[PDB]
Paper text:
The production of PIA depends on the expression of the icaADBC operon, and TcaR and IcaR are a weak and a strong negative regulator of transcription of the ica locus, respectively. As the MarR-type proteins can act as positive, negative, or bifunctional regulators, TcaR also acts as a multi-functional regulator. The overall structure of each monomer could be divided into two functional domains, one is the dimerization domain and the other is the winged helix-turn-helix (wHTH) DNA binding domain. In addition, the wHTH DNA binding domain is composed of α2-α3-α4-βA-W1-βB which adopts the winged-helix-fold, and the amino acid sequences of this domain are highly conserved.
In the present study, we found that TcaR could interact with ssDNA and the result demonstrated that TcaR shows a stronger preference toward GC-rich ssDNA than to dsDNA by using EMSA, CD, and Biacore experiments. To clarify whether the ssDNA binding site of TcaR is close, or identical, to the dsDNA binding site, a TcaR quadruple mutant (4 positively charged amino acids responsible for DNA binding mutated to alanines to produce R71A/K73A/R93A/K95A) was designed and its ssDNA and dsDNA binding ability tested. The mutant failed to interact with either dsDNA or ssDNA. This indicated that these amino acids are essential for binding in both ssDNA and dsDNA. Interestingly, the association rate of GC33 ssDNA is two-times higher than IcaR DNA1, but the dissociation rate of IcaR DNA1 is the lowest compared to the DNA fragments tested in this study, suggesting different modes of interaction occurs in ssDNA-TcaR and dsDNA-TcaR complex. Taken together, we demonstrate that TcaR shows a higher binding affinity to ssDNA than to dsDNA, and several antibiotics could regulate the ssDNA binding activity of TcaR. M13-based in vitro DNA replication assay showed that the addition of TcaR protein to the reaction mixture, and incubation for up to 30 min, resulted in almost no DNA replication activity compared to controls. This indicated that TcaR markedly inhibits DNA replication and that the mechanism of inhibition, at least in part, involves interaction with viral ssDNA. The observed biological differences point to a remarkable plasticity of TcaR. These findings, thus, may support a hypothesis that TcaR might interfere with viral ssDNA replication and establish a link between TcaR and ssDNA phage resistance.
Author numbering:
A (entry chain B): 5 to 85, 95 to 151
B (entry chain A): 3 to 85, 95 to 151
Amino acid sequence: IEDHISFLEKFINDVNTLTAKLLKDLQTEYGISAEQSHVLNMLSIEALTVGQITEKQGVNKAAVSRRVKKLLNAELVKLEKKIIKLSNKGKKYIKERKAIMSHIASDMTSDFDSKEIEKVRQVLEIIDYRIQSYTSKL
Amino acid sequence: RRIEDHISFLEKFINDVNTLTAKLLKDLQTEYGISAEQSHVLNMLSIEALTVGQITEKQGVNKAAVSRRVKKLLNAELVKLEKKIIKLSNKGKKYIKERKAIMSHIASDMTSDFDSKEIEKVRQVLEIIDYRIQSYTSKL
């Protein structure tokens, strides 16, 4: 009933704990820190302004600037005419990120029935839609 | 390309959950006067009690701040210490009630039109995957 809300909070805390560990090597190699990639993670999807990044994060604007800048500076993020995209060097990062997510996601979904995963992704697309429809409303 | 579709979705999914929980809790974290990060640090205590180290990589984001924001919790006097594990206030639970409360006033009103076999199967699948993930972790 709402053991769901906890499970979710726990499911998400575990994919973050795990993601971080598998990405530690790739992050130091790039000098980029976790939140910096985690922003490299948001911008993978769409081209935000530093303001849009804070609101979509709950954190202190100041730190979003610490990060946004250290990034451009690193030529990983490529500002556009303040709407920022992903520098082509920041692309090769993302390629190497899903390259690892995948060798573990499949390693844990060897035995699954896609015809079964299908239906849950349908349910998660609808909840997702409903959650996005709240991005709005104020 | 191939199965990257399902995780890219899973990530776009967590993202929105984070974005929303964030938005839906400002007015509330602001009303208790705490940051989000010292709140995340606060939901992990509604479970049990935590050590500065117990959270370090277990949170992901390092270990420095673990104390820096633990102290303002200590000091804003709404999360109790232990020896280096830490429990919760008991007027901090008051808050977590306020949190858990409003997060449902909305999540059910966001999933109420399904009935069961539907949702239970998503849960069952995320559970196995959560089982997998954890077993797979196993490290410092």
